Structure formats: C-alpha cells, structure tokens
Amino acid sequence: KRPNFLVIVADDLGFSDIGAFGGEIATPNLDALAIAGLRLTDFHTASTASPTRSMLLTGTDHHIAGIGTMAEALTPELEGKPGYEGHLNERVVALPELLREAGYQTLMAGKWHLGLKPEQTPHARGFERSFSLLPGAANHYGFEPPYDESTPRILKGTPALYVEDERYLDTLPEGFYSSDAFGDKLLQYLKERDQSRPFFAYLPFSAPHWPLQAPREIVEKYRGRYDAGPEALRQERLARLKELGLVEADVEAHPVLALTREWEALEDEERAKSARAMEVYAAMVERMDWNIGRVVDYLRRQGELDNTFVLFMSDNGAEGALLEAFPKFGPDLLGFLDRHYDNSLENIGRANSYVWYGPRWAQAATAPSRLYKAFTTQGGIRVPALVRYPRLSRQGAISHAFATVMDVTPTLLDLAGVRHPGKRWRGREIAEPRGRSWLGWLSGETEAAHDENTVTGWELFGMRAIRQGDWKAVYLPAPVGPATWQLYDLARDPGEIHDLADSQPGKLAELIEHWKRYVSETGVV
Ligand SMILES: [Ca+2]
C-alpha cells in the first residue's frame, strides 16, 4: 500500500513558536502530530524562501536548481550563470514530476516562489491541481497598494498574483485570507481526489510572513500576552526548550544583536505597537494551525492519515529584518506606508496595515541560535520540523540527528517505490540529489541518515557556511560580521559563540577545502 504524502511548510515561522517546540502560541493540531511523531532539532534549510523550496522539491542545492540567488536580487552580472535563472530550472526534475508519472495525484495550495511565468508555475512543474501565490509574499487579504513609479520595490515585487492551474486569477473571493484560502483549496482537492490512488499534497503557507495580518477574533486571544517584551519572551522560550528536552540545560544562548532600542528604552506607545505586532503574529500561527487541523482531521476521518507521511517544517529562520533598513526595498518605504496604510495601534493586523516584528522578537524564537533569516548562522538555517508516520519505528521522540531539506525528495521517492531517474529526464541533463533518504534512520536500522564525514554547504548574499559532521565554519561580511571565516563546534557550542579558527586552524583549513568543492560542484558565484 503506497503511502500518501502531506508536506506542510510554514513561512518564516520560528524554532520555538509551536507549543511542542516550546512556544506559548496555540498550535493544538501541530502539537498532536509532533508529540506522536518525531521532532527534529538539527534539521536545516537554506536561509530564505525560494532557495529552500528549490531544494525541498529536488533534493539538491539551490545554486544548481535555479535560485543561486533570489530572483528579486538578480544582477546583470549573474545573468547566464547556470543555476541563477531566477526560477526552478530544467537542470532539475521536481519531486511532483516524478511522482505524477508514477501514479500519484499531485495537489498544492499555497505560496510557490519558484517562478512567475506560465512555464514555471506549479501546473507546469508537476502539479495536477494547484492554487498558488506565485511571488514570495503578498497582502494576506489581497489589499493592493497603487503600483506606480513611487511604489517601494518590496511592494512592487509582492503583488497578490494568484493562479489556479493555468488560470491566472482576475479577482480574489470575498473573505479571502491566505491561510484559510489555502486550507479551503487543499481540502477541496482532497475531497475531489481519486480515492483509489495515493496523493502527494503540498501545503506551503505564506503565514506567518509579513505583512503581519490575521483575523481580529484570533488576535484578541493574545491581548496582553507579549506586554513583557521580546527578551522576557526569549527567556520563557529558552526555559521551555530545556524543560521539554529540545535543548540541553547547559547550552549558552547567543547574545541578542539589534541596532534598535531594547524594550525598556521604548516609550509606552512604541511598546504597545510592537507587542500588538507579536500578538498578530501569534494569531497568524494559530490560524495556520487551525487550517492544518482542517486538512489533517479530514484525512483522519477518511482513514487515510495513518498511511500518510506527514512532514511539517518552516522554510528558514524567523524574520528579524527591518525592511526600512534596506534601500533596495525603497524608495521611502516608511513614508509610503504612512500615506497608504494605517499602522496605528488599533488597526495593526488588518488588511490595510503593513508591519513586521523586527530583530528582537525574531531572536526570541531562534534562541539559543545566532541571528535569524537570511544569515548562514544556525538562526537562519536551523528550523523546526516534524515527521508523523506510524509505520516508521522512530516516533514519539526528539531527535538531534543532522538532517536537511535536501533529504526530503530522496526519502519520499524511497517511500513511493520510485527511483530517481539518474542524470537524464525528458530528454535533458538533470542533477542527482545531494541529500540522502531518511528511511534507514526512521525505521530504526541506523541512528542517523548522515555521519561525522557528511559535508554540506550554504551560500547566499555573500554569506557562507560549510559543515562536516558537527564542525561548521561561517563567513559573514561587513558590517554583519568580521569578513573572515569563523569556526564552531556545534556539539559543544550550538550558539556559535566561541570562534575556534585560531585555536583549530587545521580543522578550519579542512573545511575551507570542502567549501571550495561545494562552490565548484554547485556553481556558487
Ligand atoms: Ca520564508
């Protein structure tokens, strides 16, 4: 009996946000899956959305698969470079393409971020039914600003661009809210399925990505919950992570780094607005979980859930960016929002608000890790993940076994009984996976899918990392870092605090040789 797959991806959700990962946010559906399943604490993505998604659906690195950098960041200089096409390219075959030609029904509702053009949509790349937001973000209610010369580039790049199969949509339905619409559509496609054949269901939410927006009735459940601020929260999260066994009691958390004012330096009005942004975030996460519950509860009542491999993950670390801090996102983002949105306290969270919660709230959720989204430190690339599938032996536990998002395609092919086609598919050259199937590990035959000699690289925006076993070197250029390689023993120092470059040069030099091979093999520019 071939299993079904349900692959759920949160957008910018933090490590300790979910209850079963140490958080205060109501996530009852995900908690039940997590505690019955396997919770992963050493599972990694890339540091932002589209790199990670290209890896998820191929089993190889984003510099091969077409998102060598984010499409939104491409330059004339990068044009023509293999794997910097700005969309999922044809140097790869996608997981749904392989499963569909083997009898699986491929169903998707959510954010794509792997191409905007017709030949790059889910319908072109293996999904028989799909309801999708093509860009990397959008207003969750479909409220659009005017688009003219004056519009900030970050808003120009995030329109509410939706497609259903081949149909680029003209209007969005009344009551549109991104998470609810994705739950509604995937539920529709499941109810309409051929019940005599398995499905591959992909549920990439755009929540809890900015702009932070959620139903007022849910935000109201969190009124006052965050009045003590993001460092009080970080302390609550760290304590809970340790109580639950997700982090060891002796772990030294990375200090919090922000150019903004600390909570106690803020004025009452400023704190109230920041706390409300976190209340709205919490509601986004709760409402995402509610929609997950609708899908999972349907499958449960169908008697399909126990034969469904359920994977939940976030796509990168929590979002600590200050969007106002980047001229590339402008011009004049704050002024534009002042003149076109209403970010006053009582409107934060509504369709015509536009807020993001900033670096201190983000680092509460990445703690004890260093930094957050778009960095190659663990705060950017270690994300929460769970697997619920009762056939497998390793269930009910917390695992600190090393894993990455590139392992997912090989694992699901393995479970599906489908071989990766090798180096050719549909008359073209394609890449072979760099990840490894989890089935030996999850069946109890081995302790992990990787070992102390496994080598994994990362690069984005000029930031780098290279890992072998539990040794990891990081390169952060100015003014994000010292502009030289730093070396961490993640087994002793998960916070990437103690730079061993000077005391262990032999190890660093080994990892630099691995970095150079990673560059060569994947086409890093
Ligand atoms: Ca993301």
Side-chain angles (χ1 to χ4, degrees), residues 2-78 80 82-116 118-148 151-155 157-166 168-169 172-173 175-247 249-258 260-268 270-327 329-345 347-390 392-418 420-423 425-428 430-479 481-491 493-525:
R2 298 197 297 174
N4 310 303
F5 303 112
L6 179 55
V7 179
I8 311 165
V9 184
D11 195 354
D12 293 4
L13 181 74
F15 184 63
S16 59
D17 286 329
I18 291 160
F21 282 85
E24 71 293 333
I25 302 163
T27 60
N29 294 295
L30 280 171
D31 291 355
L33 291 163
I35 67 177
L38 190 62
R39 287 169 277 178
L40 311 181
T41 62
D42 204 33
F43 172 85
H44 296 75
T45 61
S47 63
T48 69
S50 50
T52 290
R53 296 163 193 274
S54 80
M55 294 166 71
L56 174 63
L57 297 177
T58 63
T60 192
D61 181 90
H62 67 99
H63 300 93
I64 294 174
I67 320 294
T69 190
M70 291 187 81
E72 297 92 343
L74 279 162
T75 67
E77 294 74 64
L78 282 172
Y84 284 71
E85 297 84 5
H87 55 263
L88 193 72
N89 65 26
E90 276 207 34
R91 303 171 192 273
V92 293
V93 66
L95 176 60
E97 289 178 312
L98 300 175
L99 288 181
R100 192 182 180 177
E101 63 177 17
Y104 276 72
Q105 295 166 92
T106 50
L107 316 172
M108 164 179 170
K111 180 179 119 171
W112 184 232
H113 212 188
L114 295 170
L116 306 169
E119 63 271 30
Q120 309 161 354
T121 57
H123 177 92
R125 296 309 302 269
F127 287 96
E128 81 186 72
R129 300 203 76 179
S130 64
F131 179 85
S132 312
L133 169 72
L134 299 177
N139 189 286
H140 296 279
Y141 288 101
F143 170 62
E144 297 297 84
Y147 296 110
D148 49 55
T151 303
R153 285 182 282 273
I154 189 178
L155 297 189
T158 51
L161 180 59
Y162 278 87
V163 66
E164 187 165 28
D165 301 321
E166 278 178 301
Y168 288 64
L169 282 66
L172 302 179
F176 188 86
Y177 177 68
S178 64
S179 306
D180 294 356
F182 299 144
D184 291 346
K185 281 279 164 190
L186 186 59
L187 185 71
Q188 181 198 329
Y189 300 157
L190 291 166
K191 284 177 174 166
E192 296 188 359
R193 76 197 188 279
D194 180 355
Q195 304 198 6
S196 71
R197 291 189 290 128
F199 61 84
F200 169 83
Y202 181 44
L203 185 56
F205 287 100
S206 56
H209 194 291
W210 45 256
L212 304 176
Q213 296 168 340
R216 26 270 115 60
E217 56 271 20
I218 309 301
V219 181
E220 193 70 26
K221 300 173 69 171
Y222 294 90
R223 187 177 274 273
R225 177 68 181 71
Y226 300 109
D227 286 358
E231 174 60 13
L233 190 64
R234 188 176 73 115
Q235 292 300 324
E236 294 187 45
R237 296 290 183 87
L238 284 170
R240 189 71 169 155
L241 284 167
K242 298 165 183 173
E243 176 195 352
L244 290 181
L246 294 158
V247 305
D250 66 4
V251 171
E252 181 184 4
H254 194 277
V256 173
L257 299 186
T260 54
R261 282 175 290 146
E262 68 284 14
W263 203 240
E264 62 269 34
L266 291 178
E267 297 179 27
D268 253 68
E270 289 176 318
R271 284 196 272 106
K273 288 173 168 182
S274 181
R276 179 62 50 80
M278 185 61 209
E279 298 173 2
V280 175
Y281 179 93
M284 291 187 85
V285 176
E286 183 175 327
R287 189 61 166 196
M288 176 186 72
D289 182 85
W290 179 79
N291 280 285
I292 292 167
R294 293 168 67 212
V295 169
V296 170
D297 289 355
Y298 172 71
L299 295 174
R300 187 173 63 210
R301 285 190 286 277
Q302 289 284 293
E304 286 298 318
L305 186 59
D306 293 329
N307 201 37
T308 300
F309 178 104
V310 183
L311 172 64
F312 172 85
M313 53 178 263
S314 196
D315 70 338
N316 55 241
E319 174 55 307
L322 293 170
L323 308 181
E324 63 267 63
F326 298 91
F329 291 157
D332 181 29
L333 175 65
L334 293 178
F336 189 89
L337 295 186
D338 192 66
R339 298 194 307 276
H340 289 282
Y341 295 80
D342 175 9
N343 283 338
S344 75
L345 176 62
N347 200 60
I348 296 168
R350 300 299 79 72
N352 67 322
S353 74
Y354 210 108
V355 305
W356 48 95
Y357 69 1
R360 296 176 181 279
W361 289 114
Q363 280 172 91
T366 68
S369 306
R370 186 173 170 185
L371 297 171
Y372 54 74
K373 172 183 179 195
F375 294 84
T376 47
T377 50
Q378 293 295 92
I381 61 162
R382 187 275 293 269
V383 310
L386 70 96
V387 169
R388 175 66 179 137
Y389 191 47
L392 253 359
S393 162
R394 288 191 194 282
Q395 298 284 271
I398 299 162
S399 177
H400 332 115
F402 178 73
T404 90
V405 66
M406 293 187 299
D407 301 333
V408 173
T409 276
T411 298
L412 307 194
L413 292 173
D414 205 342
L415 283 166
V418 172
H420 192 270
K423 288 167 192 160
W425 189 79
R426 284 202 68 96
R428 81 213 193 213
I430 56 146
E432 300 186 276
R434 289 176 71 81
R436 292 290 256 116
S437 176
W438 291 343
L439 286 218
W441 165 39
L442 297 175
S443 61
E445 302 161 0
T446 61
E447 297 290 272
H450 300 289
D451 62 21
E452 74 192 325
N453 291 311
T454 297
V455 177
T456 312
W458 293 262
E459 185 276 335
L460 192 73
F461 297 139
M463 302 184 252
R464 320 162 175 170
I466 188 72
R467 188 173 170 167
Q468 182 167 50
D470 285 342
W471 287 99
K472 179 186 178 203
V474 172
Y475 187 99
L476 299 189
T484 196
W485 280 107
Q486 298 171 296
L487 179 65
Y488 307 101
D489 179 351
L490 295 178
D493 176 22
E496 296 167 307
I497 294 162
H498 301 287
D499 177 17
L500 305 183
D502 286 348
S503 62
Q504 312 255 226
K507 175 59 67 197
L508 176 56
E510 285 167 37
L511 292 177
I512 293 167
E513 289 315 299
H514 290 312
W515 161 254
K516 278 190 212 297
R517 192 136 51 243
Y518 167 73
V519 167
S520 178
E521 293 180 4
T522 63
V524 176
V525 184

